[PDB]
Structure 1
């Protein structure tokens, strides 16, 4: 009773021709029954990607705003995302939080509006190195999860992605037992603060480093339900990561 979830976050990479090639590789690749596959292209190519991608793979926006229409030059709404045939949005990504300064409050508002509009939400959380080494990993990720939880009225269309930001571009790495450790406490937070039904049914995916060689061990961790893949989502080894349960 928890479907394996592999999301591919292309970030700000690619053009039509290069992403066409990427999409060609994904389409010919055989997706397992038990694996839910989601691709998040750059915002200019949500529409392009959805038209080229086989429908066995869902499309996600990388971000969105918190109202349906408005005076918000540079933003897109969940309504616009649905209109392009995309069914998900990535919210609270480490880069939005830490490069573009998006607050927990704002991320929460965005979650409420996305869910209300009928989109799925990949809600991202994670502690930085200085927070980890200060021994406050739990306080950070629980507070972040709390604000998301405060804006979720139905969890069936939510997926939680833990980003070990402390082990990203920093010369430090996360062992699979350290991934499992955090994932377990997050599911425990859901159990204690939301419900047992939500704790049991909610996918908690891992956003840290994953390769074709570490993906099987990571996937088999009991509280790891799949992946939000960065750089490797642009390469052929995304297919290995999709088949990490096989």
Structure 2
């Protein structure tokens, strides 16, 4: 019992005009009954996107901080995210980790607080190129996942996203088999360290390169439960990725 999950990470892209247009497209898309869809707009447009999107698509913040209110110029809290109608937050995204230096310690604390506040969390992990080539893929993503698990009580509110950071802009790419390998090792970590129950019911989505051309082969991997989509999430092509199991 794992419902197919497709998250669209718009990253720092779009304006009210172009996003309005894209939202119109998605509002007309037939989202399958077996599929849960979430879009993560730029923080300035969480409000806008929730107002314009049809309820069949949930809204995620791309990040948040770890307290409800405070002297943290530039941050938003899970309270504000809910106040705008979003029900998810993306935490630990590769860009937060490796461009903006967000530690594991910090990400775990955001997870605890987002969960305590009633949000769903799309919790991202994954290994860089140096790490993969040293043999420490397992170590790196287990450690990352351990830190997230320490701050989760209710796993029904969590989706794990594997980001093959080693394959992003590096000269390397991941095969569907390489994706499947990491996802079944992560499910083995959940079964081992949490419960078979949690393992069987927790979506592990793929956060590497995915397009309309590649989504069916990726979605048919037994341990790949969906996608955290980058570039293609800004295009009608997102609808094709949503239809991946159909």
Q: TM-score, normalised by structure 1?
A: 0.99
Shift of 1:88: 0.1
Q: CA deviation at 1:171?
A: 1.6
Q: Does 1:181 align with 2:162?
A: no
What CA distance in whole angstroms lies between the structure 2 residues aligned with 1:110 and 1:35? 27
Alpha-carbon distance in 2 for matches of 1:141, 1:207? 13
Q: Deviations over 1:33-59 (max 9, x none)?
A: 000000000000000000000000000
SS at match of 1:31: coil
**Deviation at 1:110?**
0.1
Provide Cα deviations, 1:171-220, integer angstroms capped at 9, x if missing partner: 21100000000000000001111111101100000000011111101001
Deviation at 1:29, TM superposition (A): 1.0
* Structure-1 separation of matches of 2:235 and 2:130: 31
How many residues get paired? 246
Distance 1:148 1:33 in 2: 29
**What secondary structure, in the 3-state scheme, does the structure 2 residue paired with 1:244 have?**
helix
Instruction: Give the superposition deviation at 1:162.
Output: 0.1
How many angstroms apart in 2 are the aligned matches of 1:18 and 1:214? 25
Aligned 1:210-229 pairs, distance under 5 A: 210-229=210-229
Secondary structure in 2 aligned to 1:32? coil
TM-score (norm 2): 0.99
Spell out, residue by residue over 1:211-236, the C-alpha distance to the aligned partner (whole angstroms, 9 max, x if none).
11111010010000000000110111
How far, CA to CA, are the matches of 1:135 and 1:219 in structure 2?
A: 26
The SS at the match of 1:243 is helix
CA displacement 1:42-94 (0-9 Å, x = unmatched): 00000000000000000000000000000000000000000000000000000
Distance 1:150 1:174 in 2: 29
Q: Which runs of 4+ in 1 moved over 4 A?
A: none
Unmatched segments (≥5 aa) in structure 2: none
